[PDB]
């Protein structure tokens, strides 16, 4: 019901959220048009 689990989950998934985005991802998007 409530969502404490979310909060807890965001706590330990903080790392990835704050790492820079892999150049490959952005490169792929550039290829768009």
């Amino acid at each position: 019901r409530q969502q404490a689990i979310g909060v807890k989950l965001r706590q330990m998934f903080d790392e990835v959220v704050n790492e820079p985005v892999p150049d490959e991802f952005l490169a792929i998007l550039r290829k768009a048009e």
């Binding site: 998934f13 998007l29 768009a32």
Partner: protein, 126 residues
């Protein structure tokens, strides 16, 4: 008005977090994100115009990662036989004997027959 890149880039760290959470490790997660971006760039899939770019991106991700008929059967069984399906699978699908499955499950012979019994009951009962 705004390039695909500019629309999606601020959401990348978040779908990487999602992908990681979903698949259990960062490498595997990124592979799935990568596949999703490639399909967008390749125009195989397009962002739903009814959805914010964030929602639409995750919709795209899930359009790639597609659930199959075996996956649904496996998930049904997970619901029908939550504590006992392992013993049934070890014997009926993997071909182990009950004596071998007892070794696999690290329990005595009686516990194994009990588990197989439960799973069969739950399956029979649909």
């Amino acid at each position: 008005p705004m390039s695909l890149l500019a629309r999606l880039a601020p959401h990348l760290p978040y779908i990487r977090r999602y992908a990681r959470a979903l698949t259990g490790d960062q490498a595997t997660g990124d592979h799935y994100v990568r596949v999703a971006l490639e399909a967008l760039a390749a125009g195989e899939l397009v962002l739903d115009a009814n959805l914010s770019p964030r929602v639409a991106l995750y919709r795209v991700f899930h359009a790639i990662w597609l659930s199959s008929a075996g996956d649904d059967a496996a998930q049904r069984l997970m619901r029908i036989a939550p504590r006992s399906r392992q013993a049934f699978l070890l014997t009926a699908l993997e071909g182990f004997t009950p004596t071998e499955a007892a070794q696999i499950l690290d329990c005595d012979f009686g516990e194994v027959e009990r588990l197989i019994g439960d799973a069969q009951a739950e399956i029979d009962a649909e």
